[PDB]
Ligand SMILES: O=C1NC=C(F)[C@H](O)N1
């Protein structure tokens with residue numbers, strides 16, 4: 055088995071590094087003063103970048119691969135998407151869900167993703183998708199640590215037996231309690247639904263991840279209740295507010311007041327660039343707002359924010375290959391995080407910040423941690439992002455679980471020339 | 478007595494029809510293949526349009542005919558109107574109210590209106606107008622079925638003994654429970670007032686009709702509580718939200734979310750075009766908003782919406798002859814329902830949709846129903862609307878209760894020529 059990763063570059067560090075492995079864990083990390091020779095049991099990073107695994111903090115594996123079934127989301131809105139999904143949800147079968155979830159999970163393994171948080175719609179008395187996903191979680195465990203969010207897609211108080219079904223999902227083993235306050239019939243139901251969500255999370259000792267204010271409504275401020283309840287309960291690390299796209303439309307004075315609470319609360323934020331740019335701004339004519347939450351300001355304020363893919367060929371998103379560098383690319387452009395350092399540091403949005411969002415306890419290139427790491431054939435985050443590089447090797451427990459032999463491009467000029475798009 | 482209505486056109490139907498009458502009811506409806514000859518006991522529609530009676534779903538008979546007494550509403554706003562009305566309310570007498578209400582009711586009978594819902598201000602310890610209106614209801618019964626809404630004009634929680642007076646009005650016989658959440662001192666009083674309104678409606682088995690969000694305030698969203706409470710209680714058919722002019726100013730994303738609840742709830746909506754275009758937009762300079770609720774979108778979504786006159790020469794409206802085709806004309810223009818089919822189908826907004834709003838159980842040209850119908854000297858809804866035709870005959874219980882001999886216009890050219898404005 056592998057004993058060392060050599061010739062590795064690490065974000066924020068100068069030079070090359072060697073990562074020693076023992077019993078499936080990282081035993082030590084030592085700097086190199088030059089290039090080390092390869093040998094059996096040594097995986098050569100070849101002066102590429104070594105980082106802990108990519109993370110998918112927000113995806114819907116129960117809906118993945120169902121776009122157009124039985125109908126397409128014509129308007130490209132969150133609301134029609136939920137209606138189209140309702141039609142598909144009525145046709146779910148156990149094997150259907152497992153097969154589609156596994157198809158996307160394999161793309162994720164290929165893309166160096168070893169941690170995934172999937173929401174699963176539990177506004178369904180049969181809990182068909184949840185039962186299937188709980189089996190998938192066990193089956194995929196050797197390659198991906200899958201967290202399941204009990205997501206009451208049609209509301210907690212606004213759907214028949216919504217609260218009972220949400221609790222049933224937790225009793226069956228869901229890892230995270232979800233909610234969707236802006237979809238509840240009234241603002242009061244929205245606020246009350248959050249009190250119920252927090253009570254369930256404390257009763258069962260589970261994490262929280264709310265689909266929060268995913269709407270271009272400047273009056274949708276459920277995020278302040280999520281943050282205040284987390285602060286009151288002293289549980290910010292365990293709480294996440296997904297989307298918060300309404301924040302894109304808030305006035306600046308309220309946002310400034312709010313940011314103090316967001317920081318004090320310690321809660322996490324997920325932005326979903328590919329889906330947000332598509333679903334938000336649909337009620338504007340021109341000009342049209344971008345609709346992504348205030349990622350740049352969160353980073354400047356030290357508030358933990360990260361990026362998810364959200365949908366992969368489903369009612370809310372017709373594209374995708376479950377590639378986090380592609381998600382990152384979209385987010386950096388739409389959020390205008392286009393300075394060299396902002397782009398280079400972008401990898402944090404799909405690695406460390408996402409691990410914090412998932413409350414991971416064994417993550418990072420550090421002595422004592424499990425030997426879970428990936429190798430990118432690039433010099434730094436900027437280079438990896440610019441060239442949209444594949445994952446050369448994905449290592450888990452000290453063993454290679456995925457590898458990509460890069461494409462080879464040649465142009466035939468006066469003489470053949472290899473093109474790698476580098477400078 | 479009349480035995481048949483012949484040569485009748487019916488909305489949405491081709492050709493001519495004969496309506497057989499027996500014992501004050503419609504016994505059968507049969508198609509004709511040509512024009513039928515007149516005879517005694519046959520009322521000839523003369524290829525005009527026969528429809529169930531016009532309906533007035535929202536009027537204030539306690540304030541009708543009082544404009545300028547003792548002062549005029551100078552600003553033309555809802556707020557000053559309430560202040561001017563307060564001055565007039567202090568001068569009310571039993572006979573005063575009965576005489577004015579009857580004057581407008583006679584115009585309504587002349588205009589083919591056989592169903593009227595009048596709001597009556599019950600923010601008055603003496604309940605003077607209500608006592609008078611309860612007598613008028615009995616007196617006008619042979620010609621008009623009058624519903625009375627106990628309307629707490631100055632608020633339920635924001636007026637001394639408001640709730641007690643509202644309940645007293647129901648104990649005296651008011652048919653419908655009213656409310657005015659946007660006029661309450663606070664948003665919290667507004668929401669609480671709706672819980673009290675619904676509790677009273679369920680306690681007494683009465684209908685509900687709320688003056689809801691009649692204000693150009695994008696934050697006035699009491700309509701979501703009206704719809705949610707109706708859905709919770711399973712009583713949408715019995716509930717109406719009048720005005721909802723704030724909806725004209727909502728962002729599109731919130732409106733889309735809201736519409737799902739509006740449809741699921743089954744509640745009714747009343748727009749009051751003549752008054753709304755006058756009272757709304759008064760705080761804008763230029764451009765100036767129209768201020769009518771989202772009638773076009775409600776129709777496209779299958780949400781029941783209809784039109785009322787609201788005021789006839791009162792604090793909120795200096796004009797009127799209580800003519801529903803005139804109300805319809807204004808609404809079609811301001812709401813931009815100007816396509817041929819939209820205009821032609823406009824009659825639904827002042828007939829069937831309004832009957833549903835009043836929860837009527839005996840309405841429509843159908844076998845078994847009471848023989849209540851009117852004849853318009855026009856080819857279809859479009860023609861009736863374009864030419865603002867009078868009601869040729871109004872029939873109730875199989876007897877003629879009103880008739881209008883149309884005006885006769887002649888131009889004296891090289892020879893005299895009759896002009897009917899038709900093509
Ligand atoms: O409520 C939602 N369901 C599914 C999505 F993809 C979107 O994140 N929002």
Ligand SMILES: O=C1NC=C(F)[C@H](O)N1
Pocket residue numbers: 537555630657688691752787788793
């Ligand atoms: O609150 C109100 N009172 C009277 C009117 F005419 C208007 O409908 N609104």
Ligand SMILES: [Fe+3]
Pocket residue numbers: 112113114173265364
């Ligand atoms: Fe989502």
Ligand SMILES: [Fe+3]
Pocket residue numbers: 535536537596688787
């Ligand atoms: Fe009114």
